[PDB]
């Protein structure tokens, strides 16, 4: 079957699992596992980094028949058009677009505060920017069921991703965006979303390495 | 016509300007100017930022007509969507995907060294990681004219743009890799390139902002 590779924790890896998932395809995990402190080793990976025949080693990683793929992104891509989940005219391309990269910046501010050393210390203030945040995917959301459109798409899973983890820092964070809470129901609701959440291959937590000052284990 | 809006500086929107003037697209620009330390005014861009229609607002940003694009890689994906500057089989879409993304990467790794007050003590160490970085680019590249395959693509823009960068930052990192040296002779030697290379439009450098520890004057 389809391999996908990646560290033991949901860091940016929960869209490809779920989307796996989604399109019923046949993959096997391997999740490698980092050492505790001192050290941390990460010899596990590292010793087979550069034997995968990968163009680009890293983790996340995908292996499909002889296609062998690295960059979460370029796997939610490659999923999407093999499953026919892209957007299918040019307003859902681009509102995908851009929904893929904004997920992305999100994602690295929070890794920044969440891997500071005083995390306690700008949780506060990093607290005060999160409703213009919330409130720029809400209103860009509106009154569509999905973020692209008509369908769900590859993009709708990036977003369930973000919300979900800033759901999980922040707890009140969405009270104030009602479409926002319908549409973690919606996609949490989804027939082999539901199913998948409720089975052991599922790993909603931790969400960083033990390395972090937050969801570390 | 097209309106493209950053800061007054080369940063992440060279493959932008680039791509515009390869399409010859009619655009207009709007360079915004920040104030030196320690204060470094943002209030030409902050005095409009929310005044634009943009739904997640952010530098740069593309207006073409009705439609307003954040994030760098989408509006590279919606210029080559509109001038058939994408990878035309699966296997060229796949290489597009991953360059797109391992250009992000190897930009935010140069950013994270410059924006730090470490620099000096921190130099040493990053340079030790260019040969690596260089040495996987070159084996994908191979002996292909272009990074997506036989065509140029909107790839080539991003990649030019990293490769450029980091020999500007070591002038010898590229010594050991020939095919890398063509590639940045070749891309260079289109007629829209290197015509506007000489154009009052050109902005090579500074790289950074005011904030950055190099290149950023
Ligand atoms: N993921 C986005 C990130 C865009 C972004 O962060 N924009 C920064 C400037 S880019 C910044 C940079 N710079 O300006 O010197 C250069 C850079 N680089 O060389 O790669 C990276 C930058 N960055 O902050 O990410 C900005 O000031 N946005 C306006 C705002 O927040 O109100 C994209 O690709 O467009
Ligand atoms: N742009 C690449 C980034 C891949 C990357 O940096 N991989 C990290 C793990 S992701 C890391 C992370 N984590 O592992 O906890 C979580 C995270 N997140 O939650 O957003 C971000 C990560 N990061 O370092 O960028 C790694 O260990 N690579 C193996 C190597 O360097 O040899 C992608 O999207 O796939």
């Given at each position: 079957?389809?391999?996908?590779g ?7 890896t929960h869209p490809?699992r ?5 399109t ?6 391997k ?10 080793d ?7 980094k550069?034997?995968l ?5 890293n983790?996340?990683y995908?292996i499909?028949?002889?296609?062998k ?12 058009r093999?499953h026919?989940?892209?957007?299918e005219?040019?307003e859902?391309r681009?509102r995908?677009?851009?929904?893929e990269?904004?997920?992305?910046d ?7 505060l969440?891997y500071?050393?005083?995390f306690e210390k700008?949780?506060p203030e ?8 919330m409130?720029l995917?809400?209103?860009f959301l509106g009154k569509?069921?999905?973020?692209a459109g008509?369908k769900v ?5 990036l ?7 800033y759901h ?6 969405l ?7 319908d549409?973690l129901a919606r996609?949490?609701?989804l027939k082999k979303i ?7 291959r599922?790993?909603?937590?931790p ?8 969801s570390?284990?």
């Amino acid at each position: 079957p389809m391999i996908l590779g990646y560290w033991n924790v949901r860091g940016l890896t929960h869209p490809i699992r779920l989307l796996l998932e989604y399109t019923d395809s046949s993959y096997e995990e391997k999740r490698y596992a980092m050492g505790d402190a001192p050290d941390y080793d990460r010899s596990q990976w590292l010793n087979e980094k550069f034997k995968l025949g990968l163009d680009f080693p890293n983790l996340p990683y995908l292996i499909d028949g002889s296609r062998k793929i690295t960059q979460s992104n370029a796997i939610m891509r490659y999923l999407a058009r093999k499953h026919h989940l892209c957007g299918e005219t040019e307003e859902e391309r681009i509102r995908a677009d851009i929904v893929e990269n904004q997920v992305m910046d999100n994602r690295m501010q929070l890794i920044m505060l969440c891997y500071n050393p005083d995390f306690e210390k700008q949780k506060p203030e990093f607290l005060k920017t999160i409703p213009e945040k919330m409130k720029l995917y809400s209103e860009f959301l509106g009154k569509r069921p999905w973020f692209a459109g008509d369908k769900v798409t590859y993009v709708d899973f990036l977003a369930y991703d973000i919300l979900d983890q800033y759901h999980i820092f922040e707890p009140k964070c969405l009270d104030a965006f009602p479409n926002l809470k319908d549409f973690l129901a919606r996609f949490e609701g989804l027939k082999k979303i539901s199913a998948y959440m409720k089975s052991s291959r599922y790993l909603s937590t931790p969400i960083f390495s033990k390395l972090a000052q937050w969801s570390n284990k």
